[PDB]
Amino acid sequence: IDTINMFLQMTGCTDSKAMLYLTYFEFLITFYYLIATYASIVHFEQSVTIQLFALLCMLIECVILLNITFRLYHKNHIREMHQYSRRLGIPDSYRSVINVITKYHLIASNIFVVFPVTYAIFCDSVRVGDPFTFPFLDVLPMHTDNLAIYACKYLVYAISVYIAHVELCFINTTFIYYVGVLKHRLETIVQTIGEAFADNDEQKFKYAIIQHQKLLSYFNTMKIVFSKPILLSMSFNAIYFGLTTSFVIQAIRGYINQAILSICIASSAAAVINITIYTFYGSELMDLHDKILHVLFDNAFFYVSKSFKSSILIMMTRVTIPLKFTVGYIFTINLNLLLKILKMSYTVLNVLLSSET
Amino acid sequence: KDGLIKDLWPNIRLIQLSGLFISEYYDDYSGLAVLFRKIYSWITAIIIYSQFIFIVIFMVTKSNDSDQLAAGVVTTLFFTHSMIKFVYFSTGTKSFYRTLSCWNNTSPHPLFAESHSRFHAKSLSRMRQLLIIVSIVTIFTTISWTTITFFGESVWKVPDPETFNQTMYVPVPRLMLHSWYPWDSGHGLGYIVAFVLQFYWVFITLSHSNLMELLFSSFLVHACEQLQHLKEILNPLIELSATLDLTSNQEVLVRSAIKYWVERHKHVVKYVSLITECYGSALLFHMLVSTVILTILAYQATKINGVNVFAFSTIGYLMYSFAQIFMFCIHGNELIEESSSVMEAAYGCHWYDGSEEAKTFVQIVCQQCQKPLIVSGAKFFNVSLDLFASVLGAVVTYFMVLVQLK
Amino acid sequence: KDGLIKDLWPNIRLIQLSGLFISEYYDDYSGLAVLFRKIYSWITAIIIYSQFIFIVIFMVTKSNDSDQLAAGVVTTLFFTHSMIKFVYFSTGTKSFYRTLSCWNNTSPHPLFAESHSRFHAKSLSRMRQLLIIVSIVTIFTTISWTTITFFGPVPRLMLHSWYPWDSGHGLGYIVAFVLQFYWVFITLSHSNLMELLFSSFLVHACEQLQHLKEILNPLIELSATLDLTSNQEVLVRSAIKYWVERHKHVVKYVSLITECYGSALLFHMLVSTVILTILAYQATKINGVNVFAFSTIGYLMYSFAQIFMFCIHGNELIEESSSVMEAAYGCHWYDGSEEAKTFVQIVCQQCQKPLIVSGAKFFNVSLDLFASVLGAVVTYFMVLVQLK
Amino acid sequence: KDGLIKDLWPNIRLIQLSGLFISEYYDDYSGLAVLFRKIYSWITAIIIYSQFIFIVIFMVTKSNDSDQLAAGVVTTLFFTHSMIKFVYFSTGTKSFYRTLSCWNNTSPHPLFAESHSRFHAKSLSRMRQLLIIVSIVTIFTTISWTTITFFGESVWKVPDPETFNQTMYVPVPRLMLHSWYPWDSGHGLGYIVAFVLQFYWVFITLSHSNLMELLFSSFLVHACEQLQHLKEILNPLIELSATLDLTSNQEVLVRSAIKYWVERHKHVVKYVSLITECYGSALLFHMLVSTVILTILAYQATKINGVNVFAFSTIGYLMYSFAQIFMFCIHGNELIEESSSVMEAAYGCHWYDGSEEAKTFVQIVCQQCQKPLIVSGAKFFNVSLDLFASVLGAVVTYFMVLVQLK
Ligand SMILES: CCCCCCCCCCCCCCCCCC(=O)OC[C@H](COP(=O)([O-])OCC[N+](C)(C)C)OC(=O)CCCCCCCCCCCCCCCCC
Ligand SMILES: CCCCCCCCCCCCCCCCCC(=O)OC[C@H](COP(=O)([O-])OCC[N+](C)(C)C)OC(=O)CCCCCCCCCCCCCCCCC
Ligand SMILES: CCCCCCCCCCCCCCCCCC(=O)OC[C@H](COP(=O)([O-])OCC[N+](C)(C)C)OC(=O)CCCCCCCCCCCCCCCCC
Ligand SMILES: CCCCCCCCCCCCCCCCCC(=O)OC[C@H](COP(=O)([O-])OCC[N+](C)(C)C)OC(=O)CCCCCCCCCCCCCCCCC
Ligand SMILES: CCCCCCCCCCCCCCCCCC(=O)OC[C@H](COP(=O)([O-])OCC[N+](C)(C)C)OC(=O)CCCCCCCCCCCCCCCCC
Ligand SMILES: CCCCCCCCCCCCCCCCCC(=O)OC[C@H](COP(=O)([O-])OCC[N+](C)(C)C)OC(=O)CCCCCCCCCCCCCCCCC
Ligand SMILES: CCCCCCCCCCCCCCCCCC(=O)OC[C@H](COP(=O)([O-])OCC[N+](C)(C)C)OC(=O)CCCCCCCCCCCCCCCCC
Numbered sequence A: 001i002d003t004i005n006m007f008l009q010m011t012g013c014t015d016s017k018a019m020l021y022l023t024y025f026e027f028l029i030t031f032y033y034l035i036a037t038y039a040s041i042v043h044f045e046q047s048v049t050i051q052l053f054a055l056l057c058m059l060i061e062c063v064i065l066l067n068i069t070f071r072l073y074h075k076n077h078i079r080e081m082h083q084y085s086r087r088l089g090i091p092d093s094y095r096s097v098i099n100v101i102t103k104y105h106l107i108a109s110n111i112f113v114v115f116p117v118t119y120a121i122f123c124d125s126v127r128v129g130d131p132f133t134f135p136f137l138d139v140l141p142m143h144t145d146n147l148a149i150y151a152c153k154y155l156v157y158a159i160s161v162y163i164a165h166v167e168l169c170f171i172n173t174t175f176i177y178y179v180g181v182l183k184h185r186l187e188t189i190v191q192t193i194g195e196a197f198a199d200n201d202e203q204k205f206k207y208a209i210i211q212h213q214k215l216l217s218y219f220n221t222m223k224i225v226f227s228k229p230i231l232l233s234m235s236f237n238a239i240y241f242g243l244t245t246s247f248v249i250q251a252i253r254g255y256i257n258q259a260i261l262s263i264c265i266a267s268s269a270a271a272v273i274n275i276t277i278y279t280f281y282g283s284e285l286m287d288l289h290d291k292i293l294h295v296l297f298d299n300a301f302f303y304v305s306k307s308f309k310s311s312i313l314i315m316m317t318r319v320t321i322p323l324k325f326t327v328g329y330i331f332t333i334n335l336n337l338l339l340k341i342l343k344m345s346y347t348v349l350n351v352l353l354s355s356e357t
Numbered sequence B, D: 001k002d003g004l005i006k007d008l009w010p011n012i013r014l015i016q017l018s019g020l021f022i023s024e025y026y027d028d029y030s031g032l033a034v035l036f037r038k039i040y041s042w043i044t045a046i047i048i049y050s051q052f053i054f055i056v057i058f059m060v061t062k063s064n065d066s067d068q069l070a071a072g073v074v075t076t077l078f079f080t081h082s083m084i085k086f087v088y089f090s091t092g093t094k095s096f097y098r099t100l101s102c103w104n105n106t107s108p109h110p111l112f113a114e115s116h117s118r119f120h121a122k123s124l125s126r127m128r129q130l131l132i133i134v135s136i137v138t139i140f141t142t143i144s145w146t147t148i149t150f151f152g153e154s155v156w157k158v159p160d161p162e163t164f165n166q167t168m169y170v171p172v173p174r175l176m177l178h179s180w181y182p183w184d185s186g187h188g189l190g191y192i193v194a195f196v197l198q199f200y201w202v203f204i205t206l207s208h209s210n211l212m213e214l215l216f217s218s219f220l221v222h223a224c225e226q227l228q229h230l231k232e233i234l235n236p237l238i239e240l241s242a243t244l245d246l247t248s249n250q251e252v253l254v255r256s257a258i259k260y261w262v263e264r265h266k267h268v269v270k271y272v273s274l275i276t277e278c279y280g281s282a283l284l285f286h287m288l289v290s291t292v293i294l295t296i297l298a299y300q301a302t303k304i305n306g307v308n309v310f311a312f313s314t315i316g317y318l319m320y321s322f323a324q325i326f327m328f329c330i331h332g333n334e335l336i337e338e339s340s341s342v343m344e345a346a347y348g349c350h351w352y353d354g355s356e357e358a359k360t361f362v363q364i365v366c367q368q369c370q371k372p373l374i375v376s377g378a379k380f381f382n383v384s385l386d387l388f389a390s391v392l393g394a395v396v397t398y399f400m401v402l403v404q405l406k
Numbered sequence C: 001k002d003g004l005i006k007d008l009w010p011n012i013r014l015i016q017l018s019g020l021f022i023s024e025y026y027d028d029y030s031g032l033a034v035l036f037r038k039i040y041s042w043i044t045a046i047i048i049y050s051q052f053i054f055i056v057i058f059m060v061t062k063s064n065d066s067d068q069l070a071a072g073v074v075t076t077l078f079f080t081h082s083m084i085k086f087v088y089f090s091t092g093t094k095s096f097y098r099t100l101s102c103w104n105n106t107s108p109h110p111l112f113a114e115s116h117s118r119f120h121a122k123s124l125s126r127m128r129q130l131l132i133i134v135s136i137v138t139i140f141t142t143i144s145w146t147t148i149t150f151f152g153p154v155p156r157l158m159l160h161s162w163y164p165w166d167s168g169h170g171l172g173y174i175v176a177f178v179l180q181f182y183w184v185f186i187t188l189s190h191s192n193l194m195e196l197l198f199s200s201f202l203v204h205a206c207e208q209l210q211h212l213k214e215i216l217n218p219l220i221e222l223s224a225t226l227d228l229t230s231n232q233e234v235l236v237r238s239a240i241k242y243w244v245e246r247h248k249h250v251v252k253y254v255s256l257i258t259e260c261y262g263s264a265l266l267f268h269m270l271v272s273t274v275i276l277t278i279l280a281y282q283a284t285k286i287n288g289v290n291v292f293a294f295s296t297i298g299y300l301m302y303s304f305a306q307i308f309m310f311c312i313h314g315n316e317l318i319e320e321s322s323s324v325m326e327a328a329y330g331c332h333w334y335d336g337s338e339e340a341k342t343f344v345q346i347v348c349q350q351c352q353k354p355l356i357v358s359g360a361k362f363f364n365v366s367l368d369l370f371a372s373v374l375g376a377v378v379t380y381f382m383v384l385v386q387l388k
């Protein structure tokens, strides 16, 4: 709830509009950084080690801007999902994972922002004010000057890293939180069915059926909300793993500047997490319907009122189909997709390595 | 006319005017009219296949380099789609007539007439939009084919008849297609006749191959809209069986509504089976030709440098070949999804507080509407976006392998 | 004879006359006919395996270049199909006998008798139509093997086979030629009769399923409450009984088919994968119309026809078993009695499982398997072409 | 002893004697016996991981060429299976104990007390079978590992310390594994101790891996036999509900038998879920390591020439890896087939010739036993023969690619 509340406020779901203005400011900053990086790539003269850094920065900014747009475009659906989730919480394991991911994002953002300074207080061949002494690419129109201007540019560039990490945490924690809401409501439905199979209470079974239908509607809303971020993460992570592995291999071979790993190690660590969270908790959904299916099969089925039996059989038919998180008409979000992504990543890596060498 | 014929009247009229061997859906069944129609269709077929044979002849008798062979094979296989589809429709009209006549005497139940009219209007609008898009794409392709012929040098790579192993560029007629002719198509009236004939041939072959795809996608659009209509009327049908404060009249009303729903769903299932029987092997032939087309086009794309006529030609060939596959893959996928969602719609209604007959109906619907309705191409593959994704992935992988190895 | 044996009589008779070990379905159980039959079967088997050993000998003691080795392995693996199938049927007759005896005392319902006939005869037609096709192709494969060897020092035999005697000149050459002719004909006859039997099983199951699907409507109009009595209830119960017995008979028959020719298809696929890899390699060595191109084309055509013949029938069986649900929806179950509703519901539950012939739990025999094999062969050919 | 523990008693006894950290199923819980067992397990772990560290050290501080690196990595990954399985069982016994105790107080219904026996002993006849085969495959694998060391030239290729770009062979101790030791392992007492330690380490690590694989297979065998018992008892169960000319005694007997069937199926489902929880991540790690092992072995197989030590070594490694995958793939596939076919056995009885109770029982049973019971490796993949076939196809394709390309 630490980051979920911030996500809801800055998405505009809550009444407070100030966080919506903060989201607008972050979008404007990301757009300016994207256009500045594009201008540096095209309408400027830069070296190869700077071309690769600029390409990585442009990709990161494009992904962050797309994520901001995706979460702003679905504010009403996110509001409906929060309204559903207001009643029950989430499993404590999900909350522990959310806390772990929030702490990781804080630590990683603070480390990546800091490291340029350490690299400038080391490797005496380099000095403050030139290509890799900033968390971001040197895109500001101002030139290198005294330490005051250096620090101002450093903070302005670190704002971009903090924004990227905030928007990555928002998509990493919300999927877990809402899958946990789904799971908790599913277990409550199973418990209600178990209670109904103790008193021949057909009315309580009707209540369980209503709860299951509402859960299915909420699941459809969740699919609608998370369809776009998941596809973006999938495709970008594939091509980005390829590109960043190529860059790491080249820099290990010494073709390019080694300090580029400072991004490649970090911007692919925050990527392998994004597709791991989606594919992991996307495979926990398919175990949910088995709980209802195995709680419906009971000896008490043989003592109920012959219309209770029909309802049991109808739900039993409906729960033989697992909850598949299909997005993009082709892609089912589970660990099999995690297996499948790596092969395309390796193909891209081999193509890039052969072209570079 | 009435039923599916009235909805697809522009398609059938364009098919009749295009020159395909179609005999039904006329209003002038007289000897003179029938003879004129047969003569026109036979003239169209003769011209089409003669020009195809001509462009095949100017593919083995005037090809020296492997690049020239690749380009000629790409063009020949590109128009082999229309060549196959013309004879597929011409000699297989019985299946199309059976498919077009399934929704002939069906009438909506008086309780669900408003919803049926709404979804019929939606289906008509979708069909008209598809027709407009197909016509625009065909006209744009025909225009660009004539436009790209004037942005290059009309030269041909022929072995030099003086030296041993040298090759020279000979001036060639500037036409839409490389094709041999009995006459001299290099200048004058021969050149004008060749250009006019090639323009007509390209336009009408694209028209044939696109009218087939448009008819298939319109069939699928109608099936999907009927499935949507069935999905939407489940709530009133179940509420009809509610025991709110059942008599004989209510029982017979609910039985009639259930009968209407079941009959319409069986109509949809039989209609999809008819679509598969009619346009099933056509998809198989299309995929067989497009596999070779896309392999050779990936190879051609590996040789793209800069911006010139070759890059534009290869990109256009690749885009048209992928759009043709996407057009029917998207509608097959939509049919699959909308047939699979019927159980989800039938479980989401207020069936718990319904009569025993309503519960039995919901249970049987959930049992059957669990396997999606699939249009399969000659029993080899399922038409869906999975096929399009597999084709695209195979093409991209082959292109990457060719770039890396070569 | 009666049942499946009588319907499949020509194929079984050909099997008995072709040297394969058959002990049943004979009306001459005497002390001399049985002995002579066993002697002839043993002599035939000795002939086939002596010829195969000779081919193997020529394959390793006279192969020097890589291309000669590829051709020799291609021929050896081509006849390994019949090598395996001979001992597969001869030492596994019990499963085949069970499959033929599955339809032994099954009798159609009196009210569904005509329908049964309308589907019992059609099967026979297919069960003989396939009998025609193989009977042509095999014969052609025997004739085409005698017209390509004369269109290309080595003594001109259809098979490069080592022999204890000199097969170059004199009576030895003629004897070797005749023995090679008979061996080729017998091996092809075995390898084609076996797939013919499997496909005949698969068409019989399909026509029984079609009969079941068709007779559902008369059942329901019998069970309908149109303007039930004890007689109506008895008739409906008998109709349910007959339909469910016939469906369970079909399911058990398909299980018997799967167990009878399951590992045989696994062995066939294992051999055909290697043979198709080697033919994919050799297809890159095409130098125009010649003996090599025709040989490669013929090998590919035969090795693809063999797999396709049962792949298409497996696909037909799958999609015929999957459609009994649409058949049970086609009938007007809303007008039926409550027991008819329960029967329809249980049949709908059961039909959510297409009947699939599986190659020993490894793969499913259908047109998708054939498509995968063909695509793998084509991809391998493309990779070889690009690499070379 | 009673339940599944008694059935798997030789397995548990071998695990206890094998040094794994197992503390239950003893009968001498004293202050010294527990201490002695803990000391034995701890010294076993110390020896095992020290030897593994020694092999790893020799793999990085004595490898020069890529061939030597591949040879060292293959062995290191071959024994990392045993490393992971030891550290997995030792710190995860809470799930194995739960799985072993699922069938603790269950008793068969008297009417089905016969058939259960016929299957219970059957499961034993399979478990004791799998215990024997592995007990050979392990022992043989050790013996061959002892005899292949004396069938080659024990020489290591190192750079020549006299020239610039030349490499020379240096004699190396004739030991089972290339390992680093603090003492001189070249001759005398050092060589004897090194050889004895390597022999014991290889035997005990192969035992550590094979005991866990065998326990998983035995769990699945018991589950499959319970499912077969449930399938068999269906016919007498339905014939009990037959309306042949229900009385109170018949009613209570049928209800008790149906209760037994339902509870037994619930037990089987829960037991399979417990198996997946207990031995799910172990399969994932096993496949993770085996993928790399099989990739490097596919690379090494391309360098096989004739018959020699290297060819036999590579063939043995490949055979052992594929056998390890197959051993659990076959049993997972058996569970899938046995669980999915319960509805076919419920359809095959005489439910039409039974009361409404029999038909309702058939309905619910066919609806429940429609989804097969599948063991998955941490949900990453499904344990079945499909996984083995896909792995084998991938390895064969990689080998073909390497052979054709190189
Ligand atoms: C391909 C290179 C990507 C480079 C990334 C750089 C930024 C590019 C910006 C676009 C990236 C995609 C944005 C997400 C989609 C936004 C628009 C949209 O919603 O369309 C979604 C649409 C449908 O959206 P939908 O799912 O919400 O709607 C359907 C849902 N129902 C049915 C309920 C209506 O789907 C697609 O367009 C297909 C996805 C194509 C884009 C992603 C491609 C991923 C494939 C890459 C390789 C994958 C490897 C693993 C494959 C294994 C399986 C084969
Ligand atoms: C779905 C798309 C998937 C794409 C990948 C699929 C893999 C390929 C599957 C189809 C096989 C393609 C057939 C060969 C055509 C490719 C030839 C090529 O590109 O080589 C480069 C060559 C040219 O490149 P090259 O070989 O000269 O490269 C060397 C360049 N020099 C010489 C300068 C060094 O292309 C051609 O020569 C033109 C094509 C020749 C004619 C092709 C006739 C094909 C006949 C098909 C018969 C039916 C087969 C059925 C196939 C479907 C079965 C399922
Ligand atoms: C909302 C629905 C509608 C929108 C979605 C559907 C849009 C329609 C998509 C397909 C339309 C394609 C129509 C034109 C295609 C031409 C067909 C053809 O045969 O071309 C060959 C023919 C000619 O082939 P030719 O050169 O062999 O024949 C000429 C003969 N000689 C050489 C002797 C003169 O026509 C063309 O070349 C026209 C090419 C124009 C293509 C320009 C496209 C715009 C720019 C490309 C897009 C850039 C992004 C993609 C980059 C690449 C990505 C892979
Ligand atoms: C209604 C059902 C209709 C379909 C079923 C009936 C049709 C069955 C189709 C398959 C027929 C297979 C039998 C013919 C093959 C003979 C088997 C054989 O072993 O041949 C090797 C044998 C010889 O093999 P050999 O030469 O290696 O062995 C002899 C060794 N020496 C030379 C030393 C003596 O005979 C042949 O060579 C036959 C070749 C004839 C090929 C005739 C067809 C050529 C054209 C085919 C089409 C072109 C390819 C198009 C793509 C593929 C088709 C889509
Ligand atoms: C298209 C599908 C792509 C799928 C991509 C994703 C799947 C990846 C499959 C696994 C990849 C495994 C990579 C290694 C194998 C590479 C293939 C190969 O031929 O390499 C042979 C190489 C040597 O051969 P080579 O590569 O030099 O051969 C070159 C010749 N050609 C080009 C023809 C292949 O062997 C090695 O280098 C040793 C293996 C190094 C990698 C080891 C990784 C794991 C290390 C664990 C050590 C033990 C852990 C405990 C101790 C830790 C101590 C620090
Ligand atoms: C050459 C391949 C890489 C080298 C081998 C890598 C295999 C894993 C190496 C670490 C061994 C971990 C097992 C020791 C702990 C076992 C006990 C335990 O409780 O763990 C289970 C639990 C899982 O929770 P659980 O609830 O499922 O527990 C199962 C039930 N009990 C309790 C009985 C075990 O935790 C773990 O998963 C282990 C944590 C560490 C995970 C491994 C870290 C490295 C991850 C793999 C690195 C390589 C990835 C490559 C991917 C592809 C790259 C292109
Ligand atoms: C009803 C069910 C029936 C059973 C079904 C299952 C069948 C069993 C499936 C598994 C079979 C596994 C068999 C054990 C394989 C060994 C495992 C292994 O790790 O292999 C690597 C190890 C060796 O690995 P290594 O080579 O890395 O270790 C040696 C280290 N140096 C080099 C320093 C010495 O063992 C083998 O290679 C054995 C190979 C197969 C053994 C076959 C018998 C031969 C025994 C003597 C060989 C001597 C002849 C060699 C020289 C010939 C003359 C030149």
Ligand SMILES: CC(=O)OC/C=C(\C)CCC=C(C)C
Binding pocket: A057, A060, A061, A063, A064, A112, A135, A136, A137, A160, A161, A164, A165, A168, A266, A267, A268, A270, A271
């Ligand atoms: C989506 C993705 O992979 O981006 C994560 C980016 C980082 C881990 C660092 C952000 C730093 C800059 C914006 C320069």
